[PDB]
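Reopening this ticket.

The earlier resolution said the output was attached, but the attachment link was broken on my side. Pasting everything inline this time so it's all in one place.
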Amino acid sequence: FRFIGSNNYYMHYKSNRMIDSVLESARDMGIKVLRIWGFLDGESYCRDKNTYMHPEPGVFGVPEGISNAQNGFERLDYTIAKAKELGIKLIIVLVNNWDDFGGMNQYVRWFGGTHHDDFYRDERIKEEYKKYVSFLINHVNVYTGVPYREEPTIMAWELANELRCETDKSGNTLVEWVKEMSSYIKSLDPNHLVAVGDEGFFSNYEGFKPYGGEAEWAYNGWSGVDWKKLLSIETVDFGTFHLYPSHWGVSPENYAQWGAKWIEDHIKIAKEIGKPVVLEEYGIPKSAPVNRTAIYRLWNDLVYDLGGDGAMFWMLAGIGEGSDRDERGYYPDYDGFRIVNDDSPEAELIREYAKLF
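Inline output:
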């Protein structure tokens, strides 16, 4: 099951019309897998979307006392049921490294800490993450009647989007946390693949240096991530990496080739270990002084031709509504990465390329 996929982050809080437009766009473009967020942590983040999943510790769904709020589990349930109708598979990510939608820092603030990385160490935070994950995995979808645990539309659970632990550059904190939480999920759900959801960073491996010497921090363990050691965890089923040269200190004239070497290096390590690997986020800003479409083509070709299992662009959007609607009727391109099902060269590439699958 090699595939083309994409990402969309708003499937747990937008309307049926918006959700349907992303999923029908995926199906019409030949996108078989969609990576989505399964989290909305913290009162202020839930208030800002009027949608609740984890507003406080031990509170799941809409808290008592709010009328006119949405329940993010009901939105997620709709997305899963609609994806099942359309034959789309979902990878569902369980927490963010980043503050959007609350993230690890929201957990740390609930429990009185002052450092992001306390999320991996504090046993009270670990308890709350496990409690949320068990709640979500065992949730009965109100549209299908089927618990998420038993739902084949869900392809994989992912521990944490873009996991980093800069305060432990030895790598051991995140190896211990990923062992603990991956084994924990397998004890709740023996049916589903489990992956990490991180960006892929290496930790000073002989023979592995950045193209052109740029973004050395992505190769020298700066983020606390030892990708090869994470991949070797028995309860992690496949490797994940992401690719954003424009965020990482790569020069534009090197975006193509730095991403090519990044992809080649991840495939080579995955093949040694003998586990699948997915390039699960990649993007170039629309305004970068490069040919985005030709570089997407090159990166997809390298994943496929070297034996990777999937390539998933960041990100697919559909029609917009309300304040989230541009002059063309689409959810706006707020980060310069949006692709919609239109006549752009990128959308054309994805539709034609998906026919090779």
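Reporter confirms the inline version is readable. The beta strands are 3-8, 33-37, 51-52, 70-71, 89-93, 154-158, 193-195, 239-243, 277-282, 310-313. The longest helix spans residues 255-273.
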